[model samples]
Structures are given as structure tokens and as C-alpha cells.
Target: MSIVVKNNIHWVGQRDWEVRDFHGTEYKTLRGSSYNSYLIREEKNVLIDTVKHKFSREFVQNLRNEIDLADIDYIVINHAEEDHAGALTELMAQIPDTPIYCTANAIDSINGHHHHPEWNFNVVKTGDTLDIGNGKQLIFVETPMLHWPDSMMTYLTGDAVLFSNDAFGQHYCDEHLFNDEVDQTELFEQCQRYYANILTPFSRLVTPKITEILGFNLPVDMIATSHGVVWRDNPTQIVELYLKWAADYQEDRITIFYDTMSNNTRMMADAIAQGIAETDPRVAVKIFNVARSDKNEILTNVFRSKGVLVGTSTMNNVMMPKIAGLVEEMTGLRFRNKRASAFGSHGWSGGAVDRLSTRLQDAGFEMSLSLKAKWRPDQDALKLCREHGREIARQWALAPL
Candidate 1:
């Protein structure tokens, strides 16, 4: 089963894995995932990327069924990440002299991971081109720090196809190879979430690189990424979506994350949600227990929300470590221009509220108000939490942008 593009290149990758998720603990693959590698049959056969080591045998077999092993002239390693290049060790053993093209840093990463010093490597930089056949050539675009320092993109000039390594990609595996074949809503949502969680941090560098790539004015008729389906019908739509997401992307909602040792902080979060509801019932509100909820999901919710309410139980002289760690991760994601507030329950230390507020500020959120309660909030304390909630709701309603 091969897909012919312009009756030349074929989709020679294997979707033989049931990897429902990846990235150790972060990414969630609902439709599962695929280690998509392509076979470009021009004057010389080029294999773009490979699957993980566990799928090496299946990948090799799939390649064999599509094209002869000896006929494969070049294997392009877009990045040295194990998910894409883990099978290189076995591939090198089979085709030792096959030239592997990638960025110089990719060479270091590959060597560090596999220790294969004998395999043939052809290191290239941005704007480098390799002639494959008549009017069919592969051009490399260096996209450093695009989730990995060694990441790059390739272009097939004759076909007007952009083989994006990981850019504009999603963690979805479907038999439908093009955008027109699947549900557009599901496809775009998953793609946005994938970009928001995995690639949002690098967006600062990515935006400019995307602009630079487009500045060349190459005719991009098809966009074949390393994951998910190819965007042959509307390639520019995905690119435009990436640009919008990179520019302070979020939704009109609030995420209230709290951890309660004695239920005081939990009450505060509930009060905040109620206040937000009063302002706009349509405003989505999500509440989660930090201890029970997955930190990654909380991060995703935070990414999706217009505001956040973080509450914790004071422990020792600091806020709960779980909440602290979550704050660290959120801040690291570079979430900017959002409203945030802190609330908590403390028995004696009374430090959790202030500490959480400081962390919210450090995370680049506009600190609205800090509300704290004793071991258990009395009527007065609960009113204070409610007031804080009302204030947050009002601010959100009147927010300039």
C-alpha cells in the first residue's frame, strides 16, 4: 500500500504500532501514533526518516515491499530524536554505506544515541540542496530549537511538497493520508492541541523561521509532515493556524487548580468558579485537584484558559510541592498575558497564599487578588474568597483583549 504523489514518490512508512501515547508522560495520542517515513523515488531513491528501534524490523519489511533495499541511495535524518531515528542502527548494519543526510548537530545526537561512527553521514545546513533526479531535488531548511536543536525540513522541488520533519505535525495515525479524507474538526483540534502542548514553547523561534521559509516564495502544493496526514488540499491553512497559535493562543475560559489538605482551599476554588459563572455562564470553567489530576492535563487546561485560579494547602513554610512543581512547569511553558490569582488554607504558617501569588507572578500571569483562609474558612473567610472570585470575573469581563 503506497500513495503515489505526482506518480513519483510513495508513502513507504509503516503504521504497524499501537503506541497510544508518547513523550514519556506528556503527549496523548488518541488515534495512536505512527512513525511516518517516506520513500522518494527520483533519479536516486531517498528514504526520509525512519521509525523507532522497536519497529525496525517492520519498517525494514515495509520498505522492502515498496522498493529494493540496495536501490535506496539516501536516508535523510531530519532529526536525531529516537522516535524518528532509532532504527538507524539496524538500517546502517543493513546498508552501511548508504549516505545519511542531516544537520551537523543531528550527527552528534545520532552518534551519542547509537555510537555508530562507521555509518556514512552527509551533514548539511539550511539552504543546502541535493540533486536526486531531473528537476527532482531535496532542499534542507535548518529549523533549530523546533522541539529539538537538530530539527530540519526538506522540500521536493518538482513535486512542490514540503517534507516537514515535526513542524505542523500531530500525533495522529489514520489510514486517510490527506486532509479531505478525515473529519476536519477532529483533525484540526488534535493538531492544535499537539502544537499548543509540544511546540508552543519554541514558537518564538518558529514564527520567524516559518516567515523566512515562506519568504523564499516556494510553491507549496503539498505539506507532508512526519506525523498525521498530509495537507495536500489546504497546506496554508495549517501554516496560518500555527502562526495564530504562536501568538498568545488561548480560549475564553478559566482553570481553577487546587489542592486541599482540609477542604478550605477547595472551597475557595469553588467560590471562584461560581463568581466566574455569574459573570458569564458561557465562560468555560474547569476545576481539578492537583494531587489527583495529571499535571500535564492541568498544564493543557491552563494553556486553554483565559485565566487561572491556583490554590494549595500550606505545608512547612511553603506551598504544597505538587502545586509548586505545577507552577514551575506552567511558567516554563511561557504562558503570558493571562489573569491569575492564588488562594489557600494554612493552619499556622500562613505562607501558602503569598507564595502561590509570587509563583503566579513569576509564571507571567497578571496577579488579580490573593485570598487565604485559616484551617477551615468561617463565614467571613468564605465571603473573602467569594469577593476575590467576583473581582476576577469582573476583570475578565472587562479585559481589553
Candidate 2:
């Protein structure tokens, strides 16, 4: 289905309404997502990105309905990830000679994935411009590691549209194509989740790159993302939000997550949460059972929080698999400017707290406290846990660590 986006540009992407999980189950897309391909029908026809290989046949058929495949003058690949470039293998089968414009890194990524180095490749840099006639220009900006090494963004001069591949995207599916048409709360929530899960690792680069783009002084009237809806109404709001999210973003909240064997650690978690609330009534406290809650959701809460407390029971001289795995994932994401601590209940071996503290330290989190309870957490042990939580709240309230 094609939806007109600003003058000559139309959305020609495929919406995966049934997809509940993305990136091989690492991300939970509760509202699904769309592979947003755009077709610019100007003096020279252009296609910007394509859907995933899973929908290659459908994508090609849909494109045929919009324009003749042979009439496509240039193809812009913002990122060579399979979700956007996966349909290239099928699309190129029919239009083999179409010029594919992308960064040099994208050439390698495209060939690495599609394995068709024989296709016409026009390598461009950040300032390269392609004239599409009608006084319109296609400006290429190489945004390497904006999420991927091969990522790039294309700006339409006349229409004032920035075809941002993934930077400001959300894994949200809806029939409404414009940002203003969707539920504001849900859209921003998905945007936050997307940022927390997919873009957190590269947050160090997000700020400078976006600032550089802003320095260009280009007026952006629309942002046609490669996923979800286009930001047409107040388009730059997402960009502003991105700038905020990139700078070690955090809220006045603390998250306590744990996986308990006999509910002893769970009791500790609850008590710690109460302690945090009692000490700082203004700050929000979220509690999650890692075993029962969604891992992605837990990570999202961790991303939002300024401080985090993790708890797990010791088994076979190791932390519980779920909590340990979540910490490992946290390490990979490399969330910044957050304080973390460990709490747990142990039987014979009480190494869970120490091990978790070490892992959190390795994950770039500032260690605050370590609370451990022997076997069932008695009233005294629970009191100690509450005191530990209170201490954490007090310490975290000081100047940023």
C-alpha cells in the first residue's frame, strides 16, 4: 500500500503485523513493525530502501503497483541490514542495471549479505549530491554506526524530507502513516523501547552525529523513517528527543529486578523497593521478577532508571540464569551514567552478590551496595536489605557518579 508523504514521495513498505519479536527474539515488538520503503516520483524515479526478504515477493508486487520496475532510476540503500535491503536480491532480479547509491561501507555490507557484487554501485560520501532534476537534489550523508557501520541518510532538497533509516524509528505498526495520527503515548513508548534496546550501545556517537546534521542548517519538514510511521507533524521533535536520549539519559526512578528460587530474594526485592520509596517519595521505584517478566521490558525500565538493584539466588555456586543473562545483555548494551548494586539470598554458597556486583562493575555501572541474606531472609536480614536500599537512595541522590 502506498501513502503519499509530502509531494512526490510515497510510502511503499510492508507492515509485519504478526511479528511479535524482532532481531531474533532480542526485541519485543508488541505492536509489530513496518519496513518503510519510499518511492519518489520526480523527474527521475527513485526507490529508497525495501522490505525484508521474508516479504520480498509481496514487496516487489507492491512496488509494481506503484511504478514500473524498469522506470526506477536510482535505488538508495540507507542501511544494508536484511530488514531494509533483504528485498534487493528479488528486486534486482528484475531491474538488474538500476544504479544503487550508498556509502562504500554499504557496498561491502550489501555484497556481504546479497552477494551480488556485479550490480551497479555508485559510492557516495557525506557531501555528495545527486541531481534528480526539477531543481531537486538528493543529498547523501554517511551516518556510519548510527546503528550499523553501513547506515546512511538521504535528504530530499525540494521536499525537505530526511529519509532516516533507523535513527528515529519505532517498532510500531499502524495503518496511520503520520506521527500525529497515532497514539502519542504509545508511539513515544515504542520509540523509547527501540532506543533502549537497539541504539543504547551506540549512544556515544548519536549526539555528535545528530549535532553535525543540525549544523547543516537544513530545514526538515518530514522524516521518513525506515520503520513505523513518518514524522510529518513537528518532525524535528523526534530529533530533539534523540539528542536528549543520547546523553546518558535517565529518569528519577530506580529499578529492582531479581530472579528468586524460594521467593526469599523476591521478599528482599519488595522490601528494598519499599525502602527506596520511603526514603525518596518523589522518585519512582519499579520492581520486576526477571523470571516472570519480559527481559526486554525489564531492560527498558533499567534504561529509564538512574539507579538499579539486581537480586538473584545462588545455585551451583552461580547466580540464577535469568538474572545473570540479563546482566550479560546489559553489559553488551553498555548503558551509561547509571548506578547499580546487587542483592540476593544464598544457601551454602553466598557468591551471588559478589559475582553480580563484579559483572555490574564490568558493565560500566558504578557499584553502590551489596546485600546478601543467608538462606531464608529473616526479619533481621530483611531489615538489613531495607537499610541497604535506603543507603542506595541516599548515595544516588548526590552529584552524578
Candidate 3:
């Protein structure tokens, strides 16, 4: 089905696909996703973006129904990813002379994918405007590495709309066409999750780019994104929310993870948790069985929390390989400004505890204390671990403020 947006633009995109979910994995989907390509018809008809190539036939057919193929003037590629530009080759074949408007880097990306040296291309730089007709025009903004080096956005001057390619969008599909018309809670949640998972890694660059857009001082009456519904009313609310999220993104929680073969390391983790709870009930605490818990979830938790506690049993003068591997991965992610502690159960070797402490310190954790128990912990040993936990908790509670 098609929907007319703003004054004269049309939603000439495909929505019916059995894509329960995406991201190299699948989940049950009650509302499937849509590749929302828009059609602007004024003096010259311009297709802002296209759907994935899988739906090329349907997309072209839908476009033909609305306007004759010969009348189509230009194809604007907002992004070069397959999801956005997959149909460029096929669509261009049909309308071979249609000039493709995109950024300079986008030309390389499209050529790398389509390998069509003969296709007509128009390379535009930042702050470039193209006149359509009837006083309507589109101004381009280069947003490199917002998600991809080639990504860009277009602002429709007359309509006061921003065609944000991947920024501030989610993988959600619904009949609700406007921001105020949809459920606020669900939309914001999906939007945040999209940012956290897909865009957080590049947060260092995203914040400034967003700031640049805000400085433009454009009256954004509508935000037409490629993946999700448009924010027609209260567009600034989402923009402000994005800024807030980007500013202070970590969660206020602590994760204590450990594994035990003889129950000694588990005792230390429990003691640490008790100390943390006694210090502040508001401080969220979660205990995970390293062997049972998914590593990705644990990494995500670590990314969220301000503090992390890792424990393991010593094996052959080294930490268990599982915990070592996890530490390596965490260090590679470059977690910053976080506190961490190492505790472990060792037999005669005692090498595991020291090795863990060194790893944690080298991985950029602000190490507080090292707690170790020899073999099975007696009451005295357990009490020591508990004291260590309490001390760490006290430090964490005081440092934040």
C-alpha cells in the first residue's frame, strides 16, 4: 500500500517481506520492516531512495503504476549499502540515462557493488542544493562515518524536511506514519536499541555530526528517514533525546561474573555481591555463570555497567582459558573509565589470581583490590573475600559522585 506524505511526496516503497528479523540473525516479527523509498514529483520527479534488490521487480512495478518510467528524472542514492542501493543496477538498467545523485565516496561504493562504469552519475559535495520545481529543492549534507564513510542526508528546503538516511531511524514497520500518531514508548525504545547496537561503536564521530546538523538551524518540520516512520510532529524531542543518549551512555550498574569448579570462586562472588548490596541497594548487581551465560550478553552488560568483578579457578598456573578469552575480547573493545576487580580460587599454584589482576589492570580497569582463596575457602577465607567486596563497593559508591 502507498501513502502520500507532506504535500506532494509519495511513499513508493515495499513493506511485505518475510523478514522476521535481521542483523545476521532472525527473531519472530509481528510487524515486518520496510525499505521506505520516497518519490517527490514537482517540475521533475526524483526518487529519493530505492528498496533492496530482492524487491526490485515490485518496486519498479509500483513506480510504474504511479508515474511512467520515462517521466522519472533522477535517482538519489542516500546510502550505498545494499539495503538502500541494491536495486540501483536493475533500476538504472531500466532507466539507463537517469542521473544518480550521490556523494563522491558513494560513487566508489556503488561502482564496487554494481561495476557499471557507463552509468550516469552526479557527484555532489556538502551543502549542495538541487532545484526540483515549484520552489522545492533538496540540499545535501555529507555525513561520513555516521555509520558508513559514504552515508549522507538530504534536506528538502521548501517542506522543511530532512531525509536522514540511517541516523535517528529504527528497524520498525507500522501503519502509524507520524511521531505523535505512534506509540511513544515503543518507538523510543527501538530507536535507542538501534543506536546502542549499530551506532554506539562509532559514537566518537556521531555526536559531533549530530551537533553539526543542529547548528544548521533548519526548521525541521518532518524527519523522513530510510528505515522507520517520519517524525512530523515534535521532531526536536527525538533530536534532544539523541544528544542526551550520546552524552552519558553507560548504565548505572555493576556486573560480578565468575566460574567455579570447586565452589571457592563462587563463594567470593557471592560475598562481593553482598558487600555491594549493603553499601547501596540502588546499585544494580548481576551475577553470571561464565560457563552458562552468553559471552555477548556479558560483554553488553560490561559495556553498560560502571564496575565489573571477574573470578575464576586457577588451572595450571593460569586463568581458565574461557575467562582469559573473555578478558582479551573486552580489552580489545577498549572499555574506558570503568572500575574492575579480580578474585579467584587457586590450589597450590596461586598463579591464576595474580595473572587475572595483571590482565585486568592492563585492560584499562581501575583495579581496586585482589581477593584470592586457597583451594576450598574456610570461614576465615570467605570473610576476607567479603571484606574485599565491601571495600570495593564503598569505593565505587563514593567515586561516582
Candidate 4:
């Protein structure tokens, strides 16, 4: 639906209610997501972005319904990633001569994508402004590596709304487009998950970039993003939250992630939880079977917890695939300031404990002591496992960070 934002600026985008996975299935979008594109009507007409490639025809038809295709005098591509620029080819087919305004990186991105040089490219950078008439101007803000080097944002000067590309986005689809109209907690959950899975790798660069944007002192009233709800209620609130999340965010909780081929490792995980609880009743501890859990949700928990414990059954002289996969994800995220320990059950060859410890260490975890059980555990072995958990609690409490 084409919804009007202010005077003539409209949200001309598509809602993806059926899709779940993103980034070629590297990330999961449980509640779905949207490709938000805005259309502006001043003395000059501009389309801020386009939808996913699969939705090109439908997007074009939708744009035509909102306004004549030729009236689109300019197109602002904040990012060249397919999710935001996928419909460019189809749209440009109708207006082949339309000028594309984007960063230099975005030019290389799309040129390589479509294999064409005939498209008009008016490259832009930070501090550059384009006057679109009606007392309104568009200001470009280069935000490289907020997620992607090709990423940038556009601020509508007159409306005081920042067209934040993907920085403040959430992979969610709700009936309401405004932040205040939706369930606040649910919105934050989706937004935090999006940040954790996609933006965690680039978090160290977040603070300075936002500080740079804010230095413009552009009294921001709304933040229109490439996904999920727009922030019209209080835009600054989201900015504040970003600052908090980027600062090694965590809660006073511990998450236990483990998997078992025949429920042996599962018992060890449960006993460890009992130990942690018995030692510190106030500490929040949540446990999950990685095979049965949603990977994204588990990652979110890992992101929020101050500490995590992983256990697996030994397989081929290594950790279980599920545990190793999570460790790989943690490695890519470069998770900081967290403590972790490992445990596992093995039969003929007992290598999973050391392997888990090494992988966690490589992923930037402060190694807490690890525990293991041989083949199957007897009553005394289970008691030892419980004692191991109690020791974990003691260490964390004795040296609380």
C-alpha cells in the first residue's frame, strides 16, 4: 500500500509476509520483513528505494498506481544490496535514463550486479545536499560498515526524518507502520535479533558513526528504515538503544546450549543447570537443546546472556555439528566480554571437551573450566557433574565482572 508520510512523501514498498530466511539463508526472519521504499513529490519526484527483485513487477505496478512512472525524476538508492535495490532493473527498464543517486561503493555494487554502464550514476557523499524544491532538501550521510560499506542514509531536511538504510531496522511485519502503534516489547525483540545476527560483527564501528550523524545537530523527529516499523513516536529513543546495544550489551543471565545424540549430553546439561541454580538462586539460567531450538533465537539468547555453557557428544574426534555451528557463528560475530565453558559426553574417544574449549577460546571467550563424562555416567559421575556446575557458579560469583 502507498501510504503518505508528510506533504507528498509516501512509503511505496512491499511487505514480505511469507519469506523467513535472509542473506541466502544465513539469517532467519521468523516474523518476516519488508523492503521499505519511499517516494517523494516536490518540484522534483524521487523514489527512495525499490523492493526485492522477485517483487519487481508488483513493485512497478504498485508505483504506477501511486504515480506515473515517468514522473519519477530521480531515484535514491541508499544501499545497493538486492533487498533494497533489486527492482532497479525492472524500474529502469521503463525509465532507462533516470539518474541513480548513491555512494561510489553502491555504483560498483549495481554495475557488477546488472553488467551495464549506460545507467546514469550521480555519485554522492556525506555533506552533499540536493534541493528537491518546496523548501525541502535531501542530505546524504555516509555510514559505511554500519552493516555494509555500500550503506548510506538520506535525511529529509524539511521533515526532520532520517532515511536510515538498515541501521535501525528489524526483520518484522506488523499491521502498524509507526513504532508507537505496535507492541513495544515485540518490536524491540525483533530489532535486537536483527542487530545481533547481522550487525554484531560491525558493532565496534557503530558508536562513532552514530555520533557523527548526530553531530549534524539535525533535530531528528522520525527515522524511516529499510525494514520493520518506522520511528515517528520518538526517534531519539532508538538511537539511545543503539548506543546501549553496541556497548557489549548483556544481562545478568546465563544460557546453556547443548545437544545429545542419545540424551546423554542432555542429562549433563540439565545437571549443570541444577548446579548453577543451586549455587546462585538469583541468577537467571535458561537451557536449550540446540537441535530442537531455533538457531536465531538461540543466538539472541547467547547475545543477551552474560555467559553461556555449551555441551555436545563427541563425533569423529570433535564436537557435535550443532555445537560447532554455534561456535562458528560466535566466531564470526566476534562476541566480546563474555565467559564460557564446555562439557560433553564421549564413548570410545573423549575429545569433545578439549575441542569445545579450543573452539570457544578461538571465538573470544574467557575459558571457564570444562567438564566431561566418559561413555555413560553412573550415580557418582552424575554427582560429579553436579559438583562441576556448583564450581562454575562459585567461579562466576567469586570473580563477578
Candidate 5:
């Protein structure tokens, strides 16, 4: 079935409702996702993109139902990632000679992934335009590294829609396709999660690229993303939020994550959380067990927090595995402008706190106060933990934005 996006453009993508995990378990798509492909029926029949390989045959069959394969004059590949071009192999096999328009880097990626050099490729750069007849034009803008080097956006002049492939997208799917038709809270939650997990590392490029796109002064009535809902009602709202999230964004919240063997570190985490709450009633606090809690959720919480505290019990000579893995992931994410501290309960050997603190520092976090409780934390140790939490609240929670 085809859903109308604008005058002549329709959504001809695959709806994936059962898949719960994406990117090999890197992102948890609890609400599922969609590989959004668009079909533009202008004087020149253009297919905006294609769905994943798993549904390639179905996607092609769907396209055949909409329009004969031989009639599609052009294929625009905004990004060549498998999720977006998974159907290209099956698609191009049928319409073998159809011109595929994309960025120069995208051509390399498409070939690299599908290994099809025989397919017709037309590379486009920023400001390039293709006349699709009927006084309408398709404009290309190179948005390299928005999430991938091959990524770009397609602008439709007549309908004023921006085919923003992955940008402003969420791993969320529902029967309702438009943003205003869905639960606003859940929509934005998935948006935040997607940005935090996938785009946070490339935050440095987001603001500038957005600014450049905005500088074009194009009318964007609808933003047709490659994943999740299409932003037709007040489309630029997502762009506005993207600008805000790109600039070292944070809420007045603290996240405490810990892994425990004997519950000592868990006790320390709870006491620290209490201290933070008592010290600053206005600040929000969240605590998670690293071993039990979802890692992606923990990362999203950490991304939203202005400050973070990681705790773990010392095992052998290192921190607990889960906490260590979380920290390692954080280091790779390169989160900016956040304060961090560490705490742990140790036996005779006290290495978890020092090691975790160093790791946080190396991960580009502003190092703050750290605490170490020997063996099981006694009343005094718990008191000290509270004091340390109070200090954290004073130093980080009450600190200026």
C-alpha cells in the first residue's frame, strides 16, 4: 500500500514491526522501525530510495504494483547503507539501466556493498539539480558525516519536502506515519534515543551542517526521513530540536550506574543517589544496575544527564565487567561537556575508583570528586558516601550550565 506524502510523492517502504534490535544490538528498537522509501511521480518517474535486503523482493513487488519497473527514470540514493539500499540489488536487476543519482562517495559505498559496477551511476554534489519536468526540480545537498560519509538530502521544489535520510529520524514505527498523528512523547523519546546512540559521536558536524542547510532558505513543508515517522506537521521542529541536541545538550539530571558482586557498590550507588536528592531537591536523579539494566538505556540516560557517577565492586584487580564495558563504550562515544565521578567498594585492593576515574577522564569528561569504600561500607562509610553525593550535587548539580 502507498501513503501519499505530498502531491506526487508516496511512501513505498517496508514497515518492520517485529524487529527489536538494530545495528547488531547497538540500538534497541523497542518500538520497531521502518525503511522509508519514497516514490515521486512527476513528469519523470523517480524513486527516492529502497528498503532493506530482507524485504527487497516484497519492496520490488510493491513498486511494480505502483508503477512498472521499466518506467522509473531515475533512482535517488541519499545514503547507500544496507537499510536504505537493501532493495537496490533486486530493484536494479529488474530496471538494470535506470540512472541512480547519488553523491560521489555514495557510488563507492553502493558498489562496495552490492558489488554491482554494471549499474548506471550519476554522481551529484551540493547545489546540483535535476529537472523532473512540470516546473518542479530535485535538488541535492551533500550532508557528509551526518551519520555516514555517503549521506545526503534530497529537496523537492514544488512540494517543499526534504528527504532527510537518517537525520531527524527515530527507530520508531506505528500505523500512523506522520509525526502529529503519533504520541508526541514516545516519538521524541525515540528521537532522543536514536540521536544519543548513533549521532552523538558526530555531534560536532550536526550544528554546522544544519546551519548550512538552513542557510539555503528552502521551504520545508515536510521532512520525509528514511526511518520512522514523516514530519509533515511543523517539520522544522525536529530540525530545531536537532540544533539544540547537537550543542552539548543536557538536562539538570544525574545518572548513577553501578555493578555489584556483594551489593556493596549497589549500596554505595543508592546512598550517593540519596545524597544528591537531599542536597538538591530540584535536580533529577536516575540509578541503574549495569549488569541488569539495558546498556543502551544507560547510555541514553548518561547522554541526557549533566553529570554521571559510575560505581563498581573491585574484582581481582579490575572493575566489574559490565561497568568496565559501559565505560569503554562511553569513551568511544566521546560525549562532551559532562562532569563525571567514580565510586566503588573494594577488598584489600582498591583499584576500581582510581581506574574508573582515569577512564572517565580519558573519555573527555570533566573529572570531579571520587569515593572508595573499603570492603562493606559501614555506617561511617555510608555517611561519607552521602557527603560525597552532597559534594557532587553542590559541585555538579548546582553548577552553572
Candidate 6:
């Protein structure tokens, strides 16, 4: 069923309430997700985007129910990622000659995925305009690296809605389809998690791009996003949040992540967290078992934290798989301006702390101390680890040692 976003803006998207993972099991979707596609009806009808391949058939059929698929005069692809263009291959079979509006890079990405070089594409870039009739027009703005190389945003004149692609979206499914209707806390939390996991690596590009776009001074009453709720109310809220987050955000908190065998490493993690709180009672502390907790959620916590402490047990002279996975994500995310420490326990030859410290440095973290215990830690050794935690907290706060 298609719901009208405004006068001629109808949502013809598909919701994935069961989708727990996206991007080939990398992004963990906590409350499922939606593949948002929009249909704009005017003298020249246009379809803004499409869902993933799994929902392509139904998306096509439902779109047909709303209007003749042949009647769609043009198709606007804001991004060439499969989730945004997955229905193109199936939908294009019906109207192969329809002009597809996108960036030049989108042409290669689309054809690379489907090998259909013959599809009609009208290459566009910044400041391109398409008159869709009814005193309205569509303006495209290139936003490369917002999520993908071909990503861009579309501005609808008269309607004042900005089709913001993946830039200000969350992996969340909701019935109401607008930001204010959903639980506000949950909505922002998911949005933060989405940014932390999906967009952190590209943060260096966010500020300048948003600054340029906002310079256009387009009257944006709503932000039509691809993955989550439409921001009809306070549309620029996410944009402001993005600007703040992109400026190397941190909070007065610390988080400890660990996975233990024989419970030795876990003890050290707990002691460190305790030390952090004991040193600064006002600061918040969070702890997670990386092996048990969802990594996406944990990364969000890590993103908010000023300090991070990682602990693992050595097996085969290597860190545990769960901690290793977290290290992989940290390297890819490239979290900025955070202090970190590594700790571990080993039965045989000890290498986990050293390896973890190396990874932490490589992941762009400032390391303070590395700790390891031969077996279970004695009280004195745990106290030393606690002191190490206090040292990390001080550095995290940018205080003199």
C-alpha cells in the first residue's frame, strides 16, 4: 500500500521487519529496516527510488497498482547502491526506454550489477534541474561519500522536501513513517547507531558537504530519507545532529568490551570500569561482552565514549575472535580522538595484549597502558589495572597527568 507523504509524494517502499542484518551481515539492524522508494505524480510522473532485490517483485506490482508502470516518465536514482536501485533491473524490463536520472558513476554501478548497458540513463551532477511540471522541478546535488560514491540528494520545488538518500537515515521500521510519530529516543538512538556503524569512516566529508548544501538555503520542510522515518517535522534536526557528530563527538563516559575464557580477562575489565567510575563519579561507564552483545550497538556506545578498554583471553597465542572482530570494525571506522587501553590473560605464551595494543594504535587510538595477567589476577595486580584505568580516564578528559 502506498501512503502519501504530501500532495504528490507517495511512499511506495517496502519494509523489512525481519531484517536483522544488512550490507552482507555487516550492519546490524536492531529494529529491522525499510527500503524507501518514492513516487511523485505530476504532469510528468517520476519514481524516486526502489527497494532491495528481495522485495523488487512486490515493489513493482504495488507500484503498478498505484499507477501504470509505463506511465512513469522518468526514474530518479539518488544512489546506485543495490538497496536504492535493486528494483531497476526488474522494473526496467517493463519500460526500458524511460530516462533514468543519476550521476555518471551510477551508470557504471548499475550496469556493473546487472550488465544492462542499454538502459537509458541521463547523467547529471551538481546544479542539474529536471522540470517535472505543475510549477515544480527537481534539483540534484552531488553528495559523494555521504554513503556511496554515486550518492546525491534531490530537492523538490513547491513541495520543499529533500530526498536525502542515506545521509540522515536509520535502520528502523515504523508504521507511522514520520519522525515525530515514533518514539523519539529510539529513533535518535537508531540514527546514532546507523551513523556510528555506517557513516563514521566518511565523517571527514560530512561537515563540508552539509555546509555546502545548507549554503544553498533551500526551504526544506521535510527530509525524505531512504532507510527510516521521514523527517517532516523539524526536518533539519538530523542535519544539525550530523554537523555536531562529524566534529569528532565524544561524551563524559567510558566503555569496556571483553570476552573471557576462565573469567580472568572479564575480571580485569570489570575492575577497570570500576576504577574509571571511582575516579570520576559523574562519568558514565558501560560494559559489554563482545561475544554476547550485538557489535553494532556496542560500537555506538564506543562512539559515544571518551575512553575505551578492551580485554580478551589468549588462545593459540592470539586474541579471541570476538575482540578481533571489534578491532576490525574500529580500524574500518577510524574513530577519532579517543584514548584506549588493552588488557588480557594468557595460559601459555602471552601475545593478546601486545597484538590488541598494536591494533588499537592502528585504529587511531591513543594508548596509555597495556596489562596482562599470568593466570587469574591477584588483588594487587587488579589494583594496578584500576590505576591504569584512571590514567586512561584522565587522558580521555584531556587533563594533565
In candidate 5, where is summed lDDT lowest over 10 consecutive residues? 392-401
Give stretches of model 5 more than 4 Å off.
399-401
Per-model TM-score, in order, reads 0.93, 0.98, 0.82, 0.97, 0.98, 0.97
> Over the full model, what C-alpha lDDT does candidate 5 score relative to the true structure?
0.91
**Cα RMSD, each candidate:** 2.1, 1.4, 3.8, 1.5, 1.3, 1.4
Steric clash pairs (candidate 3): none
**Model 4 lDDT at residue 401:** 30
Local accuracy by lDDT, each model: 0.83, 0.91, 0.80, 0.87, 0.91, 0.89
lDDT value for candidate 6?
A: 0.89
lDDT of 1 by residue, 1-401 (tens): 77775457788665633776577765656677666788888789999999888888887887888888999999999988887898888878888889999998888899999998778889899889999988778999998889788899999897899999788887777887887787888787678778767886777887899899998888999988888888888788999988888877778889999887878788878877877787676678999998887665677778778889999988888889888888887777888668898888888868888988998899889988788778777777777777777788778864542
lDDT of 2 by residue, 1-401 (tens): 68898889999998889999788888888999999999998899999999999999999999999999999999999999999999999999999999999999999999999899999999999989999989999999989988988899999997999999997999999999999999999999999999999899999899889888888888899999999989989999998998888899999989889999899999999888878788877679889998788888888898999989999989989899987889999999999999998999998867988999999999999998688888887788888888887888888884442
On a 0 to 100 scale, what is the lDDT of residue 59 in model 3?
85
Error of 3 at 139 (Å): 0.8
Per residue, candidate 6 scores C-alpha lDDT tens digits across 157-271 of: 9999999989899988999899989999989999999999888889999999988988888899999999999999888999999988888888887888999878898888888
Lowest lDDT 10-residue stretch of candidate 6: 392-401
lDDT of 2 at 354: 96
- Look at candidate 3 and tell me the lDDT of residue 90: 78
- lDDT by residue (tens digit), candidate 4, 1-401: 79876668798998999888898777888888988999999899989989899999999999999999988898999998899999999999999999999998888988878776799998899999999998999999988887777889999987888999798989889767889988888899998998888888788899999989878989787899999888998777888888888998888778898989989888898888898899887678889998998888888888888888999988888778878888998999987788899998999878888988999999998999889898778888889889988888877673553
Clashes in model 6: which pairs? none
Worst 10 residues of 2 by lDDT: 392-401
lDDT of 2 at 299: 89
Residue pairs clashing, model 2:
none
